[PDB]
Design an enzyme around this catalytic site. Structure first.
Site, PDB file in Angstrom:
ATOM      1  CG  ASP A  43       9.223  -0.113   6.678  1.00 12.79           C
ATOM      2  OD1 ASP A  43       8.213   0.240   6.068  1.00 12.79           O
ATOM      3  OD2 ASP A  43       9.143  -0.488   7.837  1.00 12.79           O
ATOM      4  CG  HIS A  44       7.830   2.851   0.074  1.00 13.15           C
ATOM      5  ND1 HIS A  44       8.126   4.145   0.181  1.00 13.15           N
ATOM      6  CD2 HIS A  44       7.346   2.695  -1.191  1.00 13.15           C
ATOM      7  CE1 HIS A  44       7.857   4.756  -0.934  1.00 13.15           C
ATOM      8  NE2 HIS A  44       7.385   3.885  -1.758  1.00 13.15           N
ATOM      9  NE  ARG A  45       5.784   0.092   7.718  1.00 14.16           N
ATOM     10  CZ  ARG A  45       5.675  -0.647   8.809  1.00 14.16           C
ATOM     11  NH1 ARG A  45       4.489  -0.814   9.406  1.00 14.16           N
ATOM     12  NH2 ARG A  45       6.765  -1.189   9.356  1.00 14.16           N
ATOM     13  N   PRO A  55       5.844  -2.913   3.826  1.00 12.41           N
ATOM     14  CG  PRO A  55       4.883  -0.834   3.475  1.00 12.41           C
ATOM     15  CD  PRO A  55       5.233  -1.821   4.545  1.00 12.41           C
TER      16      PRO A  55
END
Ligand SMILES: CC(C)(COP(=O)(O)OP(=O)(O)OC[C@H]1O[C@@H](n2cnc3c(N)ncnc32)[C@H](O)[C@@H]1OP(=O)(O)O)[C@@H](O)C(=O)NCCC(=O)NCCS
Ligand SMILES: CC(C)(COP(=O)(O)OP(=O)(O)OC[C@H]1O[C@@H](n2cnc3c(N)ncnc32)[C@H](O)[C@@H]1OP(=O)(O)O)[C@@H](O)C(=O)NCCC(=O)NCCS
Ligand SMILES: NC(=O)CCCC[C@@H](S)CCS
Ligand SMILES: NC(=O)CCCC[C@@H](S)CCS
Lengths: 243, 243
Positions: free
Chosen positions: A215-217, A39
């Protein structure tokens, strides 16, 4: 994932099939695998490089005497290396359990070279340990080998972070795709002269555009706005790396 | 060497004897041994530190947040360390055969602290490897221990080069004595605002005075004028250490 329906394209006019190189096919598979796994967010920032640029330009003789050409890529590589150590979550990868991060204690950085056969991303190891003229020389060696199909897979491995620069061609910003399993990539576009408010009037300042996708995680919005903020601050006074 | 004839000083008025500390007596013996062994020359130079000074002053918050105070001594230590590696004859000692130089591959630098008991010259090891705030902290630790008689002889050993700064008190230049078996010592005096010709008119530039004394058996006049020239150039743009 649903496939796209095939279309008889020749119904609308003349068509011609040209095939993709294997490099392109590898390239395509990796981008799509990154796209669906990561994401993506992109954080945009502008750095004031007026003085960095005047430094670059004055060291032109030193650089020529050393046989290297000092572009902006080494100055970005050095600053990003310092930062990948200040903010270690950017220098890490999501463990396959999805419940751990693997923090790397080494800084190796890749950079995108677009070649005729397709995209290659050579890696410069221990960027934190080399100097601007060392990184200048190595970057150029690696890019020539890349263009010449003489780069060995050895040099395409185990990067931490990627810089993708299109400043030599044009543009204002773009949204690069994270080169997974890395967790961020810095896109750099074209520097323009820009009016910048000094408290009283606008002053022309040479502004460099940065586009950090992440990488927004693993990285949250505030950590990323802090990374481009710090990077804009280091590029405004690179002597702060000295302290 | 002929001795000085003793004079009955009380013939001219009232006198009082105060004794010298053992530290002073050691100090005195070493200076005289250096004086008679080293044919001394001093090379004078002025460096433009206008921008270095504005850097120093802006990093005041970073420094305060780190609990150190960033003075000029770390910026001199870092630049001299870079230079002691560029010009290795300054980082060496005359072998006792008088027919060889011993080049040291390590850079440790001492600095003069004048204490009430006498002169101490604590040594900071591997100056080339530490950063401006590390050198800032260590310099200050070492000087406090020196003033407190708590410095151990361990820390007074095996320096390569000495910096002697009187800029905090005043003066224009002086001729320091080489701390033999080292081969050079940099004296630093007080910075003044000074008119400097820019090709068209004079511009005020903050000028720092440097006085390099050297052992002329080992260093010749041109090597030394080149050392103060390079040092003035590095202090004018400390980013050149980056390359
Ligand atoms: C070291 C190397 C690998 C990368 O160099 P670089 O930082 O891209 O710089 P280049 O010299 O290629 O750029 C061409 C010109 O555009 C300029 N340019 C580069 N970045 C710029 C930016 N962000 N904004 C505006 N102009 C820029 C350069 O300074 C250079 O100017 P010049 O021709 O007057 O010297 C280089 O040898 C090379 O192979 N260049 C080809 C371009 C490339 O593939 N770059 C990929 C970097 S991720
Ligand atoms: C780190 C340390 C060891 C050396 O510091 P320093 O570089 O001498 O700087 P100081 O802070 O002591 O100097 C006092 C003031 O004179 C200034 N000064 C120092 N060098 C100067 C120079 N060459 N020209 C003009 N002014 C100068 C300082 O910047 C400082 O200004 P401030 O009071 O406004 O902050 C320090 O903690 C210390 O112990 N200082 C006491 C003085 C001393 O013995 N110095 C020996 C250095 S070889
Ligand atoms: N290295 C690869 O084979 C995949 C493509 C690279 C990922 C990034 S550079 C895409 C940038 S938009
Ligand atoms: N260290 C000593 O005991 C001797 C004195 C130092 C030599 C130099 S610092 C003299 C400077 S003028």
């Amino acid at each position: 994932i649903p496939p796209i329906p095939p279309v008889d394209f020749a119904k609308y006019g003349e068509i011609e099939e040209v095939p993709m190189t294997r490099l392109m096919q590898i390239g395509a598979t990796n981008l799509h695998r990154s796209w669906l796994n990561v994401p993506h967010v992109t954080q945009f920032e502008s750095a004031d490089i007026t003085e960095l640029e005047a430094f670059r330009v004055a060291q032109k003789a030193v650089a020529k005497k050393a046989g290297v050409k000092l572009t902006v890529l080494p100055l970005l590589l050095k600053a990003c290396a310092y930062l990948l150590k200040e903010l270690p979550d950017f220098n890490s990868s999501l463990a396959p359990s999805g419940q751990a991060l693997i923090r790397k204690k080494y800084v190796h950085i890749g950079f995108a070279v677009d070649t005729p056969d397709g995209l290659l991303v050579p890696v410069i190891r221990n960027v934190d340990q080399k100097s601007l003229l060392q990184l200048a020389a190595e970057a150029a060696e690696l890019a020539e080998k890349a263009r010449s199909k003489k780069l060995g897979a050895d040099a395409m491995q185990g990067a931490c972070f990627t810089i993708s620069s299109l400043g030599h061609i044009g543009g204002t910003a773009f949204t690069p795709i994270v080169n997974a399993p890395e967790v961020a990539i810095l896109g750099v576009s074209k520097a323009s002269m820009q009016p910048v408010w000094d408290g009283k009037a606008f002053q022309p300042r040479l502004m460099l555009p940065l586009s950090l996708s992440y990488d927004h995680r693993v990285i949250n919005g505030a950590a990323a706005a802090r990374f481009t903020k710090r990077l804009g601050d280091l590029l405004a006074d690179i002597r702060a790396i000295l302290l």
